[PDB]
Amino acid sequence: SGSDEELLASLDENDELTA
Amino acid sequence: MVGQLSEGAIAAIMQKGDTNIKPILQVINIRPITPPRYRLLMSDGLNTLSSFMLATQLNPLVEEEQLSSNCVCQIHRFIVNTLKDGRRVVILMELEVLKSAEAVGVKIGNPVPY
């Protein structure tokens, strides 16, 4: 359902774009 | 007892993405993934889904064991974020604990991972 990393990246959509 | 939970809510959030619902869900388990941020495996009696994260304002509910494995809760406010890979993350902003883990006593039904 998602790595912890992309879950945490989802809190900051700018970070999610390049994760 | 699966009729005590909002069966179909997990599929509905994952598909329609609407946040105008107040689903009643069972907590299966809770894990810090980091000021700790808690990740929850939740069940609607039909499915389980682990892409749930608790707003840190609600951390005391976890730390004082009111939100804990097998408790039943009702979500009153949540946000949906959709990742590049198509996964959807639910942030739980407000909720009510309806029945303690101790009062429920079991995992309700036999939900399968979404």
Author numbering:
A (entry chain B): 7 to 8, 243 to 259
B (entry chain A): 1 to 34, 39 to 118
Tell me what the authors wrote about this structure, in their words.
The heterotrimeric Replication protein A (RPA) is the ubiquitous eukaryotic single-stranded DNA (ssDNA) binding protein and participates in nearly all aspects of DNA metabolism, especially DNA damage response. The N-terminal OB domain of the RPA70 subunit (RPA70N) is a major protein-protein interaction element for RPA and binds to more than 20 partner proteins. The RPA70N domain adopts an OB fold with a five-stranded anti-parallel beta-barrel but has very weak ssDNA affinity. Its primary role is to mediate protein–protein interaction with its basic and hydrophobic groove and a side pocket, as first shown by a series of studies of RPA70N interacting with p53.
In the RPA70N–RMI1 complex structure, RMI1 residues 243-259 form two short α helixes with a β turn in the middle. The overall arrangement is similar to the complex of RPA70N–BLMp1 with the N-terminal helix in the groove and the C-terminal helix binding to a neighboring RPA70Nb. RMI1 L247 of the N-terminal helix fits into a hydrophobic pocket at the bottom of the RPA70N groove. RMI1 L248 and L251 interact with the hydrophobic side chains of RPA70N I33, M57 and the aliphatic part of R41. RMI1 D244 and E246 are stabilized by electrostatic interactions with RPA70N R31, R43 and R91. The folded-back C-terminal helix also interacts with RPA70N K88 by forming several hydrogen bonds. RMI1 N254 inserts into the side pocket of a neighboring RPA70Nb and forms a few hydrogen bonds with N29b and R31b side chains. D252 also interacts with S54b and R43b, further strengthening the interaction. Superposition of the two structures showed that BLMp1 F160 and RMI1 N254 point in the same direction but not at the exact same location, indicating that the second RPA70N molecule is able to adjust to different peptide sequences for binding. ITC titration showed that the RMI1 peptide binds to RPA70N with a KD of around 14.5 μM, mutation of N254 reduced the affinity between RMI1 and RPA70N to around 25.6 μM.
